[PDB]
Design an enzyme around this catalytic site. Structure first.
Site: not given
Ligand SMILES: Cn1nc(N2CCCC2)nc1CCc1nc2ccc(Cl)cn2n1
Ligand SMILES: [Mg+2]
Ligand SMILES: [Zn+2]
Length: 313
Positions: A68, A72, A217, A269
């Protein structure tokens, strides 16, 4: 006055594409942004000396956190540039002016923690703004910087055009609170499918701009795969640091923020692409056909994450 900004040929060509990466040279980010305002808005939207002073104060008020940060900020503004240039005639003189600034300012003074962590820490910002905590702070920091002497890039606007443009920027920044995204999109889906969506309805533009904002975003997931994958390291670096801090307050963090659950990243992911990004870019493509490249690229990266799980990389 007669002072065009130009970019090397490869940047000149690639900047126009949704998947463009702004590169690792920080010192070119400001010139990239000004280039994008001049092509998007006209060379006359802003007094160059004021724009530059605003850009540099904005940069100074972004922190050295892993995700952040200032990079970004400019990435999210470039996505908006590609959306605005691919939907030329759908947007007012003021929306073009206000949305690139909203994107530059949308995470001002972020500390690398979730609204959740502020509340559980009992940060003063959480007493002062009960919901969309950081997002209200971000808007708040934008008005601060706009009020610094020499920084008011909106000075040539009428009293009323000013209020309109600060209100676009406010809703636009609030919209990047991903808790609000889910409601906003479901409403936009229902409205587009029943045929009620009316772009002269100002509450309807509001929602549509809100979705563009979410789409910009999250543009990390719409990049070429090596960019998408290395950005994910930065995202988890913040989230895992927050999980550490959560454990310090005597709280199990959610799995997404637990660094013990590294192994499950690929599957995380997947969930994120399916629950969040794909729907996001789907609804955006229905409403704004020429944004389809963000959807195509999102799908491509989902397919790359499926490959990771299957031990094929
Ligand atoms: C929902 N979730 N649960 C997990 N974990 C559980 C255990 C291993 C990982 N990881 C995620 C997503 C992580 C993520 N957040 C974002 C925010 C913004 C962007 Cl542009 C990409 N990403 N990629
Ligand atoms: Mg924000
Ligand atoms: Zn942002």
């Amino acid at each position: 006055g007669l002072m065009q900004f130009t970019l090397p040929v490869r940047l000149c060509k690639e900047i126009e594409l949704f998947h463009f990466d702004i590169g690792p040279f920080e010192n070119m980010w400001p010139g990239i942004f000004v280039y994008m305002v001049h092509r998007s808005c006209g060379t006359s939207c802003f007094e160059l000396e004021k724009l530059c002073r605003f850009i540099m104060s904005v940069k100074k008020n972004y922190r050295r956190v892993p995700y952040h940060n200032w990079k970004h900020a400019v990435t999210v503004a470039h996505c908006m540039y590609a959306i605005l240039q691919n939907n030329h005639t759908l947007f007012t003189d003021l929306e073009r002016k206000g949305l690139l600034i909203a994107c530059l300012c949308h995470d001002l003074d972020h500390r690398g923690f979730s609204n959740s962590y502020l509340q559980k820490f009992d940060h003063p910002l959480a007493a002062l703004y009960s919901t969309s905590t950081m997002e209200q702070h971000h808007f708040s920091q934008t008005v601060s910087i706009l009020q610094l002497e020499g920084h008011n890039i909106f000075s040539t606007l009428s009293s009323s055009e000013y209020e309109q443009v600060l209100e676009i920027i406010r809703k636009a920044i609030i919209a990047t609170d991903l808790a609000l995204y889910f409601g906003n999109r479901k409403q936009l889906e229902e409205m587009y499918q029943t045929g009620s969506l009316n772009l002269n309805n100002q509450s309807h533009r509001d929602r549509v701009i809100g979705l563009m904002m979410t789409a910009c975003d999250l543009c990390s997931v719409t990049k070429l795969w090596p960019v998408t994958k290395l950005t994910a390291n930065d995202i988890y670096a913040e989230f895992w640091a927050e999980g550490d801090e959560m454990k310090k307050l005597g709280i199990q963090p959610i799995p997404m923020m637990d660094r013990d659950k590294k192994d499950e990243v690929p599957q995380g992911q997947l969930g994120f692409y399916n629950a969040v990004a794909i729907p996001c870019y789907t609804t955006l493509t229905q409403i704004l056909p020429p944004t389809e490249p963000l959807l195509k690229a999102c799908r491509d990266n989902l397919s790359q994450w499926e490959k990771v799980i299957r031990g094929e990389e």
